A paper describes a structure:
The three-dimensional structures of AtTPIs confirm that both enzymes assembled as dimers with asymmetric units containing two monomers that fold into a canonical (β-α)8 or [name]-barrel.
The recombinant construct that encodes pdTPI eliminates the first 59 amino acids that correspond to the predicted chloroplast targeting sequence. Previously it has been shown that residue K84 in yeast TPI exhibits breathing motions, since this residue is located at an analogous structural position near pdTPI-C89 it is possible that structural transitions may transiently expose the thiol group of C89 to the solvent. In contrast the addition of GSSG did not induce a significant effect on pdTPI activity in a range of concentrations from 0.87 to 4.3 mM. Our structural data suggest that the H-bond interaction of pdTPI-C15 to pdTPI-Q8 is responsible for decreased reactivity in pdTPI-C15.
Residue numbers in the entry:
A (entry chain A): 5 to 254
B (entry chain B): 4 to 254
């Protein structure tokens, strides 16, 4: 499967800061064999689609579980597509653990998004209390099962592993610990979906990724790319992380 | 003693093309002068609406995050709503309370934050059918109000919207009389728990089923100060007529 780098801007940016970010992304020279995706806040998706190079795809940060209608404050898959999105991020750790979105709810969001023709960036990952109880793979496999029990197909799914236990806990995750989770996620796909899906599905790393560690991470056999957080807000650094694909080739 | 207020909540509806037509119909309408008019597009269309809609109508977000932006994937901050030109945000809407599950203190915090950052707040309250039938209409509504009151820095830029959630789809229907009974109690609650000044200046608007066939009638009730319109706000000419239903309140 082809190297994938997405930037999750989260709840950050204004018209002006995003205009500068877009200008920097457009000026960057990006390597050829990489799928590149950015994920603006809902309100800026129009601005980004109007001015960002079409070499980069656009993702929503969330989407409603089904068709639109009486869901005040929510955005539908139809509306994301209408605005030009090709992806949606679903089950991001902040939506699981800050908002409180549950697994089956997330699984349903994905099935709907995939059946309506969006790609899905499907996020999984365990918290500190969970890892400290030896439940890393139990947690991730239940999250995967909830996806697998619901989705019509894995063709347009990218799996993102987030080490929530490292994200802000003062703990840091090594490329070895990352590789360990990715290779297990791939094995779960082999045994619970199929061998074909396991090899063609991209498993991207969604821990702390920056210009100083992307080259090292890209070397791991089962890390197929990144879901970048804070660094995705800095155009040149994000471009360099995208271009870390060359490190996977060396 | 407050100016008539009519908001249109588009909820999770619309595309570029339908919203472009809605905006044209809204722009073509002649709206009565003594009314505050507000529309609330889905997040992704707020930019499109701000670019083309007459400045006579204010724009509202349908929700906002509880505090400053940052690591909250999928959420929109008050800073961003303001950046796009919104002057209002709807908070504690029944669909966010009962479908999404947002709790009172959380909603109260959202409103306090939005107001401190300079947005007006349409603060929604209302009881479910099970609650109404057990005699807890005012327990629920007053508790929802206390949660706002305990948090907000001021009531100057607050509009209270009462939603009869008990009628919203439950097969029951709400009359202007039943709405009036709730609104008069809410205003009384404000008199005793905030001040007489706030009670008389605060708009308390009706957020039940409002359409071109009942708005003139609803607008006649003494303590209904306007509307938070659902389905009808997607039909421009009908929304305009509802705004102009203010003439019914004078007659």
């Amino acid at each position: 499967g082809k190297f994938f780098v997405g930037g999750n801007w989260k709840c950050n940016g204004t018209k002006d800061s995003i205009a500068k970010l877009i200008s920097d992304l457009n000026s960057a020279t990006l390597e050829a064999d990489v799928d590149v995706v950015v994920s603006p806040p809902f309100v800026y998706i129009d601005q980004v689609k109007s001015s960002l190079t079409d070499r980069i795809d656009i993702s929503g940060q969330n989407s409603w579980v089904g068709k639109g209608g009486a869901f005040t404050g929510e955005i539908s898959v139809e509306q994301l597509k209408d605005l030009g999105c090709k992806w949606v991020i679903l089950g991001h750790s902040e939506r699981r653990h800050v908002i409180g979105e549950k697994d089956e709810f997330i699984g349903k969001k994905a099935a709907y998004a995939l059946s309506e023709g969006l790609g899905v960036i499907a996020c999984i990952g365990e918290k500190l209390e969970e890892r400290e109880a030896g439940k890393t793979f139990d947690v991730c496999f239940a999250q995967l099962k909830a996806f697998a029990d619901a989705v019509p197909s894995w063709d347009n799914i990218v799996v993102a592993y987030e080490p929530v236990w490292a994200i802000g806990t003062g703990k840091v995750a090594s490329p070895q610990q990352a590789q360990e989770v990715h290779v297990a996620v791939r094995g779960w796909l082999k045994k619970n979906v199929s061998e074909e899906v396991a090899s063609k599905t991209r498993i991207i790393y969604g821990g702390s990724v920056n210009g100083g560690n992307s080259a090292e991470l890209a070397k791991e056999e089962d890390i197929d790319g990144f879901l970048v957080g804070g660094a995705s807000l800095k155009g040149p650094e994000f471009a360099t992380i995208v271009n870390s694909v060359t490190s996977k080739k060396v």
